[PDB]
């Protein structure tokens, strides 16, 4: 089997992407944030504290003839940005782009943190990291991909995120029309539960390539590109007037600037992030200070190849017995 679904930016900055997901019988369609950096599929629901729902579409298990309470199971998750959610668990039928999993754990939120409430466009998350990170207790549950894998034509999914435009998540096949040149594959460590890999280096603008190993995670649920302070300083040094602002919480730059591109290495291959992808707009409405899309990972504890990086590529998440990651230009 295969599936194919369009993923759409939630706003004009590409802060996140939502993908429609059918849950239950009859189908309830919710728009979920596909997140290769976590491993829980959770949704706003009829069980979510009423004051914490503000415009989201909710899953109502009592209206699904295939929903079953997973007795005794609870979940609770905290994300890198400080947000969190928790609740109980149902199993139900879940379909993405025509690909159906029966008996998928659907984690129903009883509580969500303010950032989730305040974002009316995201109805929940669909985790695509390794199932070892799943938070369901006392019996850990499998991701949608893990459950689908054996049925797929090939045990892969692909992320093709758009810049200020829709893109695609495919399951079970590689669309050879969706990228240019060849896909370069690189090793993955699953030791931390992430799609963790090592970039071979970087360049800033038309500058020379610096060969250096950068361990990090391919994370569709993180907006920006977080890299070591040395790398980030070298990038922003090429933008007149750019500076790191402790009050804003990262590098900012004059909105009048033209940003240089940033290249990262995948083996001997190179992925080029155009400068415009690194512009996240005014820090506050009407400001002429703009927020940068490349930020320091110092104090995160890990480098993160988030959407800024991934949207410059066609990315293969290869879930074979030994997983690997592939990147192509597009």
């Amino acid at each position: 089997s295969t599936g194919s679904a369009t993923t759409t930016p939630i706003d004009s900055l590409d802060d996140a992407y939502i993908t429609p997901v059918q849950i239950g019988t009859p189908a309830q369609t919710l728009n979920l944030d596909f997140d290769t950096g976590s491993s829980d599929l959770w949704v706003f629901s009829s069980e979510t504290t009423a004051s914490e729902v503000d415009g989201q579409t909710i899953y109502t298990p009592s209206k699904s003839t295939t929903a079953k309470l997973l007795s005794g199971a609870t979940w609770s998750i905290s994300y890198g940005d400080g947000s969190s959610s928790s609740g109980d668990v149902y199993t139900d039928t879940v379909s993405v782009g025509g690909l159906t999993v029966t008996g998928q754990a659907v984690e129903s939120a009883k509580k969500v943190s303010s950032s989730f409430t305040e974002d009316s466009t995201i109805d929940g998350l669909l985790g695509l990291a390794f199932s070892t990170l799943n938070t369901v207790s006392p019996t850990q549950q499998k991701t949608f991909f893990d459950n689908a894998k054996a049925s797929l034509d090939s045990p892969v999914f692909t992320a093709d995120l758009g810049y200020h435009a829709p893109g695609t998540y495919n399951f079970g096949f590689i669309d050879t029309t969706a990228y240019t040149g060849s896909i370069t594959y690189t090793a993955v460590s699953t030791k931390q539960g992430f799609w963790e890999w090592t970039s071979t280096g970087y360049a800033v603008g038309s500058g020379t390539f610096k060969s250096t190993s950068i361990d990090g995670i391919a994370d569709t649920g993180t907006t920006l590109l977080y890299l070591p302070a040395t790398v980030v300083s070298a990038y922003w040094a090429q933008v007149s007037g750019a500076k790191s602002s402790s009050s804003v919480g990262g590098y900012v730059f004059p909105c009048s600037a033209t940003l240089p591109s940033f290249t990262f290495g995948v083996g001997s291959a190179r992925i080029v992030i155009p400068g415009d992808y690194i512009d996240f707009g005014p820090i506050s409405t009407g400001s002429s200070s703009c927020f940068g899309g490349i930020q320091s990972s110092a104090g995160i504890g890990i480098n993160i190849f988030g959407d800024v990086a991934l949207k410059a590529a066609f990315v293969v998440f290869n879930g074979a017995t030994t997983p690997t990651l592939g990147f192509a230009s597009k």
Side-chain angles (χ1 to χ4, degrees), residues 1-62 64-67 69-109 112-141 143-148 150-190 192-242 244-330:
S1 62
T2 65
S4 182
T6 298
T7 193
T8 302
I10 64 166
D11 63 23
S12 66
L13 299 176
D14 297 348
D15 282 315
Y17 298 78
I18 49 170
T19 308
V21 177
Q22 282 70 49
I23 307 176
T25 310
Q28 300 180 39
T29 299
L30 274 65
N31 294 329
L32 304 189
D33 184 351
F34 283 23
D35 181 14
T36 64
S38 68
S39 306
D40 288 50
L41 192 175
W42 74 262
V43 297
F44 278 79
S45 78
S46 56
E47 304 180 324
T48 310
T49 300
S51 60
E52 296 179 351
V53 184
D54 188 3
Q56 296 81 10
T57 295
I58 64 168
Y59 170 58
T60 303
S62 66
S64 174
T65 58
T66 43
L69 179 70
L70 185 62
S71 179
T74 58
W75 62 281
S76 179
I77 193 162
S78 300
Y79 297 102
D81 68 353
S83 69
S84 61
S85 52
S86 59
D88 53 19
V89 188
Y90 292 81
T91 55
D92 209 339
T93 301
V94 174
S95 300
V96 176
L99 171 65
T100 300
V101 167
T102 58
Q104 175 63 46
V106 177
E107 301 173 34
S108 168
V112 303
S113 67
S114 59
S115 178
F116 288 114
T117 299
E118 291 161 1
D119 183 4
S120 66
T121 73
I122 290 174
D123 302 325
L125 266 65
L126 189 149
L128 292 168
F130 293 87
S131 293
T132 54
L133 294 178
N134 177 266
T135 76
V136 178
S137 177
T139 307
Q140 187 170 65
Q141 300 294 304
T143 70
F144 174 83
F145 178 55
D146 218 336
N147 282 323
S151 302
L152 295 176
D153 290 358
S154 181
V156 304
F157 67 91
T158 65
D160 180 9
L161 304 177
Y163 167 66
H164 294 174
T168 306
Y169 281 102
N170 290 329
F171 292 83
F173 72 106
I174 289 162
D175 179 355
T176 61
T177 72
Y179 57 87
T180 62
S182 59
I183 305 176
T184 296
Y185 290 85
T186 198
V188 165
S189 172
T190 65
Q192 295 191 81
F194 299 122
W195 292 92
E196 187 171 1
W197 65 290
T198 302
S199 172
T200 48
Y202 70 97
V204 176
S206 61
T208 63
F209 186 86
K210 176 71 169 182
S211 291
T212 185
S213 294
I214 305 174
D215 294 342
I217 65 167
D219 184 2
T220 59
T222 291
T223 312
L224 308 184
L225 174 54
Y226 295 87
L227 293 172
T230 48
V231 178
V232 176
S233 183
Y235 178 81
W236 290 108
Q238 298 304 310
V239 179
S240 298
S244 182
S245 170
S246 57
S247 61
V248 176
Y251 280 89
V252 297
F253 68 92
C255 292
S256 61
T258 299
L259 297 177
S261 62
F262 184 90
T263 301
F264 64 93
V266 183
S268 55
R270 306 287 180 255
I271 298 294
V272 180
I273 305 172
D276 291 346
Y277 289 27
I278 299 161
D279 178 13
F280 279 75
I283 60 173
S284 291
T285 303
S287 180
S288 70
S289 182
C290 274
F291 198 68
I294 296 176
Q295 296 294 345
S296 179
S297 65
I300 291 176
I302 197 159
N303 301 304
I304 307 173
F305 293 87
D307 298 333
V308 162
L310 303 182
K311 75 186 169 195
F314 177 88
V315 188
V316 181
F317 294 81
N318 171 28
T321 303
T322 301
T324 64
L325 272 172
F327 294 81
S329 295
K330 65 187 187 190

